[PDB]
Amino acid sequence: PQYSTFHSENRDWTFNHLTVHRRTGAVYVGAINRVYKLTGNLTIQVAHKTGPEEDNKACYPPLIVQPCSEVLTLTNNVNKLLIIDYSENRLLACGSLYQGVCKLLRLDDLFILVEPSHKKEHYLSSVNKTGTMYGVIVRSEGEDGKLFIGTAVDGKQDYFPTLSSRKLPRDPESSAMLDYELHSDFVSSLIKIPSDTLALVSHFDIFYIYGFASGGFVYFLTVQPETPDLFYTSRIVRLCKDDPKFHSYVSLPFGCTRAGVEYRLLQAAYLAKPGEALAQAFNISSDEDVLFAIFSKGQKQYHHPPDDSALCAFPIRAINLQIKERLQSCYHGEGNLELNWLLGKDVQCTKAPVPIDDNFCGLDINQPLGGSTPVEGLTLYTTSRDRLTSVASYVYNGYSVVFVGTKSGKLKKIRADGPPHGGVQYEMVSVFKDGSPILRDMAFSINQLYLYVMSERQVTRVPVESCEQYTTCGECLSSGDPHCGWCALHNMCSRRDKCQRAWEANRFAASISQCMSLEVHPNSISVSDHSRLLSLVVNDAPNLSEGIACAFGNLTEVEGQVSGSQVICISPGPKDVPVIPLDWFGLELQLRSKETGKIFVSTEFKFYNCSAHQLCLSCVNSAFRCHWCKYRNLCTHDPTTCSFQEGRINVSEDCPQLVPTEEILIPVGEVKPITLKARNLPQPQSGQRGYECVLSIQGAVHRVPALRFNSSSVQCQNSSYQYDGMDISNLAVDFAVVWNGNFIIDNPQDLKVHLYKCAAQRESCGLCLKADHKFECGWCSGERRCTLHQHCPSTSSPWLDWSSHNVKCSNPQITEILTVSGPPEGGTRVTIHGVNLGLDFSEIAHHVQVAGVPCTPIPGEYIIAEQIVCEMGHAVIGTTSGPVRLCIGECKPEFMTKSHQQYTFVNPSVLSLSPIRGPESGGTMVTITGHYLGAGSSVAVYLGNQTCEFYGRSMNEIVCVSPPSSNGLGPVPVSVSVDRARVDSSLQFEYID
Amino acid sequence: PQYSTFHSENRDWTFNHLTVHRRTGAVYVGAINRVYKLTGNLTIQVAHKTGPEEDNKACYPPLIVQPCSEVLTLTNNVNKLLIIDYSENRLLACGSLYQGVCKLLRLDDLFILVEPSHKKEHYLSSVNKTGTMYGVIVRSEGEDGKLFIGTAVDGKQDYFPTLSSRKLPRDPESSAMLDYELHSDFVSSLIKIPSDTLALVSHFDIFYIYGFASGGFVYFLTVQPETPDLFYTSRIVRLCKDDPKFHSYVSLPFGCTRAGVEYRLLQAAYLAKPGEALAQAFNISSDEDVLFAIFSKGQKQYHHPPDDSALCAFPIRAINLQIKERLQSCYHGEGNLELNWLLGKDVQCTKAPVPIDDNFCGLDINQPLGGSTPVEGLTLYTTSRDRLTSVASYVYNGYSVVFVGTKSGKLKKIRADGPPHGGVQYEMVSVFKDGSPILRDMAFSINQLYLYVMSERQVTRVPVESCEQYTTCGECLSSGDPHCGWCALHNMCSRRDKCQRAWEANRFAASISQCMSLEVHPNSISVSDHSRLLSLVVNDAPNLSEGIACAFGNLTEVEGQVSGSQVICISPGPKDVPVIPLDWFGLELQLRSKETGKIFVSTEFKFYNCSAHQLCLSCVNSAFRCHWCKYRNLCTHDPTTCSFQEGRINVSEDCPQLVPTEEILIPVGEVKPITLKARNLPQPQSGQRGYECVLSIQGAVHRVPALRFNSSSVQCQNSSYQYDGMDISNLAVDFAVVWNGNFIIDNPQDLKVHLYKCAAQRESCGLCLKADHKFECGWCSGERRCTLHQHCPSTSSPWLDWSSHNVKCSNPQITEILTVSGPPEGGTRVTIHGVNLGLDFSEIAHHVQVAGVPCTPIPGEYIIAEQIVCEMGHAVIGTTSGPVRLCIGECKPEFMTKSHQQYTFV
């Protein structure tokens, strides 16, 4: 995954600019202290040295013109401009060293041709910051050459023009090399920043981000502070290619807007062609120029632009038009020139009957010309965090593809479409692992297969395309990547020219609709059904007539027979069929193109083992075509192998099932028959044995033979059953009905036999009578145990069973009761748990008493004969504590129960609170200390009518969380109420602000 | 001495139980084959028959429920329970017949009201041995009735509960009569002996000796074998009166100890009140309950308990306390329940915060409850041989009186006092002559005057007290019998309420110090001093003002004069005074109350005869006030009757008398005066003659007048005396000195005059000189006779008298000698008797010879001049026999004697 790359010789010698020779493919890198020439794959050929050199920016004129008194420092020479002069096979390189002098280098060896340094203007600027200077070379046929150059000046407004045109004579040894194109007192090919403007506003300067030639004009894109937080303005500056007087100078703001965000800070730009979608969107020819630009949100933070940034497009035509309209309105006498930083003041437009042509190049009046109304671009794409930093674009197959660098070293691939979407990112590559921001200069290899991209530390050759990353025709043709098509027979996503035989029928899909799927019939076969002929159909296929082979996973590959989009193939033979893990086994059935040699389509093919099913219902309900052979008692794929035609079963409905009856109750140790009902029981055929019932009891499994009366009924013979443990009274046991030794009849309901021993579970009379009347299990007095009448001897007629329930059950006892203590006021909910209580609520009611005190029981809370929940009444009585009494219904001497331990009455009290004070909002953890705090059922804590949130309770303390004082700050009462008792006290709680 | 008694109709139909109706006094006896109703004095009114009936103990259910296949025998119906149901005027009687069915009988006629017999529990037990079952009826006001019953079960642990509570409805015809108070599978008003316990130990059983209700509880006292010789344990079993579930069941051992003996085998018991002494000893109110119990020594021999047995007392309060402490420690989780025969095993107590009140009636946990540490009683009394067999008690005048039966038919009356003594037996009655043991059931008549006591053959009504047996105030009030006081005027030991007028002054003595006594002055009178007034004082007397009479033994009864406690009476008159046996004569002087008619006090009164004394010394030394009248020569009580004031003698010192002098020697036929000495000789007064001396000689009594020189000396005048006979040389004669004719002066020494004759007695010279030197009688040669110098003429100076004894005598002769023969060897003691031998031994020694053979005489054996005892020397000499020779001192020719017959040697 590694691209060709070139690193800087040193960590401080950062890269600045980059250009590729359109004809040679030679790569030129403008760097600190170095100008590099490299091969296509970034192998260095020449390293031209440009620094460092001792210098001082205060030294003006430079050391090469004058000796300097200032102290010198070894200074880095920043590349500030790098431009190929194609006509003259040379390269222009200008550094920051010595006030910004320039060099001309020969392309092949970078040998210095000349270095103009005697005239004042031969020094461009002392600024040592990149992204502030840009140049454009313009040389027609009959002209020797011209250079337009714009630069920040660093306040040295008298040292350096901000924009100017220079001579670029074909002859390197011309004395006028880099001289002003025109230079007189009041008419020169240059613009100077007025002294008054720097005085008014500093650090006022003009930064030249980008420049280009289009038609009969040159264009510069600038950023500069605005003139009366610091606000900046991004502008388009236009000049005619032929205009020594600079009378054609005109300057308009520009930017773009989307989704309520104005993007006004220019970051980067690139001239390209529209592509079909934008050409239509802009109403222009497909070979007209479009300006692609990056802007950051707003008009502030020039040195650290907002991450929120946008890619925008400006048709050159739309720009020229807005410029013409401006010229026209001005030459009609409307408004002012509106360029304060230069004109210094308000200057009114002068009306003059001059026709403003498309190629109007200005006059003496109405120039230079500014303007306030911005040129609006079409916003194509925006990001919120990974700030866009660079841009390059080109047209592939009518699609405008835009490459956008990011501050984190990512490269975005945007496909440009007009409204309403604007642009779509179809890929983002991670180019620089160190996360270094992508610099402005990006350039294509001569045939646009690669895009050269740079960071401060690195130049990297990035493939325009990585289509191979899409592994299905679907992914490939829906990626949105203009370069990517589907190479059908090679099963590969690639460029058309990368797909072999792409020009032949259906070899290359350019549209999702031109993609494949594979249909097989049958889509599954019995494992025993080998050497089958299968019918394969290829949807959306190309010519397969060259030949097709079928691959059954790893198992097999046989030559298929081809007729159109239909393929016929023989399935694996006996030796080669897969083995099934114990019902089926899937694999990918694949077609290999004989034309290309590549597998290009696939689909799942499954082998099954009807034999895997060994019960009728299982076999029948298989997902695959299986048949149950009634008599042969097996599952098969081939119905003709059943013993008789009558033996074939296809649906579960007629599978020889057991129907349910009322619950099967079986006592342990008693001889009983178990009649069963069922449906479609088979008559055992020749060589087949009869029916048995198998009981799956962990302790012991019993095998009892049975007789099948008819299709509907069965019956195990008289036998007794038992299990060891005596742990559980009611044990349900799964039973399986088998015939012929191992054929188990299906049991959908999963009917089970309940083996009961009369209470393993119930030690008490109340529990037995509680249980089902069905069991017939009942309590037997003498044993003090519980079993059926059969099981218990009749000394007398009495063994007792709850007839309807009208059976009283003696000797009630109380094990333990909750809420040991309680408040004297009462209201407490006493929870009494006993063994042998009354069966009905109505009897227990009025039964309960705590000593003298009457207690009223609660119905819902009352669990028969196990537990009684009762509410105590008003206790102010003589005794401190008293025992609890239960009277089953009559307070007979046999019939009463007394508690082992006695219930104690008290009266809880509270002395103090851990935090006395707390905030009005509340939420304070209060700790109230006292005595007998634990008593009773419920607790409610009260501070100033609004309740406290309870947490935990203890004998000693109660902890709760305070409510907001809905009240005002100050003292508040604390009321605590437990049940019926409400206790109050002098300790108070103070709410604080 | 015979009490009211009732005998059994038959020798085999033994008595079993006994109860007395507190209100009617009706006596009900539970016996074999009979229930008897009797009157207070044991006269039979109704005899209700209960047997015999054909039966077999193997027949269960009984014949009245099921036909039996077992062979039947005519069976005796033993009374096993007999209880009066006071609320419902009926009686509960349960026999051994038919597995122990019960009957209810109407009190008045013993007509059967009902006989529960359809339900299993209606049959109590097949045991046919008495003293194994006991019941207690408990019926408050709002309840219809309840019966607690405990019984031995005879191993039929599934047939019969050992302890249970039953319904006793007021309505006799109730269908639930004698039904369990509560009956369910695992909760019933009953305790059953576990099967495993009988298997482990047999013949394990529980015997219920006694039962009672006290406060809010019922109590049963049991004996049973101990569980791992056979050791038995006696226990107190307590239950709350109201507790159908029997959760209140608790059981502790009990007994008592004294003098290194543990009494642990329960024999009998009885609930009573303490009496003051025990109430203080036990620190309880005098109306709290006390359990009186009999125990035998040790914990073995249940069927024949040791004779060594004890009576003990247990305050109910002390019992309840020890039970509470047990409950408390258990409900604190300490130790086990400790009742193996029932629980079967070790069961740990369960700690639970339950307050144990005085009236705690148990819960489900920690019950039934046993224990190992015994309840110790206070030992009141013990016996070693007559084994105690029964007990009953009550309080009389603050004294706890305990009645204890014995195996030999004796009834002991014990007075209970606390430590250190414990109890004191103040009486033992023999109740049954046949020696039959006293049975357990004893009961008081309604007013506790009698105690009904029974043997197997007999019911006897025994008086609580028999105070009349004490016949003197002293015996009565020192018997130690709380019932007995002294009824002064009736001279009777009795109960206070039995003494007439007991509420009047001094009529009833409750203390020995209050015993009457009688003082008389004078306490003795001369017999001649008749019709005297005497002053009688009655100490500790009651009002005598009704009248008093004095009785002088049988002799007299005269009306006395009464002033307070003083009585004055006239002594017997001349005709009626007693005669004295020859100095005095005592009799009982008695007072008879005119109010009651009874003699009630007495004291000794003596009559004397100063006249009875007839010698001065006798009269003077009398124990009574007598005076000797010197001149009138008589003893008197009245000194003013002496002749002269000078005649009165009061002390013996001046009783006049004749004093002795050297012996008075009087020769016969010689004129001699006899001077005498004496003391306080009286001067004869007017009309009185002088003194004479009278000699009392049988032959002749001589009267010689004498002169009294002074108070000290007398002398008979010159006269000669003689007596006829010549038989005895020395004749002492009593002499009496008389004056005034017949007044004889006293002679204490009884001085006599010796009349001696020169030898009437002695024919030989040796005998005279032998006699007293005093006589002066001596031998006179010429006469060949013996008389005084005066009597024999002196031809010459020679008449011979043994000077010192150095006088040789003449013509010795030998009459006869003993040991005629002798051995040649010698050594023989020769006894020679002669007439006229030597006076001294020293002369005779060396005198004696038998022929040639020397013979040595013996000093002690030698009697002067009469006999010589001599020892012969070695005889082997020539002669066979030889004559014996005596040489008085010198072998003079006149001086030698030769034996008439000769001594022979052989």
Residue numbers in the entry:
A (entry chain C): 36 to 263, 273 to 626, 629 to 1039
B (entry chain A): 36 to 263, 273 to 626, 629 to 952
The authors write:
Class A plexins (PlxnAs) act as semaphorin receptors and control diverse aspects of nervous system development and plasticity, ranging from axon guidance and neuron migration to synaptic organization. Plexins are large type 1 transmembrane proteins comprising typically ten domains in their extracellular segment, a single membrane spanning region that is predicted to be helical and a conserved, cytoplasmic region that contains a GTPase-activating protein (GAP) domain with a Rho GTPase-binding domain insert. All our PlxnA ectodomain structures show autoinhibitory, intermolecular “head-to-stalk” (domain 1 to domain 4-5) interactions, which are confirmed by biophysical assays, live cell fluorescence microscopy, and cell-based and neuronal growth cone collapse assays.
We determined crystal structures of the full extracellular segments of mouse PlxnA1, PlxnA2, and PlxnA4 from eight crystal forms providing a total of 13 independent structures that range in maximum resolution from 4 to 10 Å. This interface is formed by blades 1–3 of the sema domain of one plexin molecule and the outer side of domains 4-5 (PSI2-IPT2) from the ring of a second plexin. The residues in this interface are conserved among vertebrate PlxnAs but much less among all plexins, suggesting that this plexin–plexin interaction may be an important functional feature of PlxnAs.
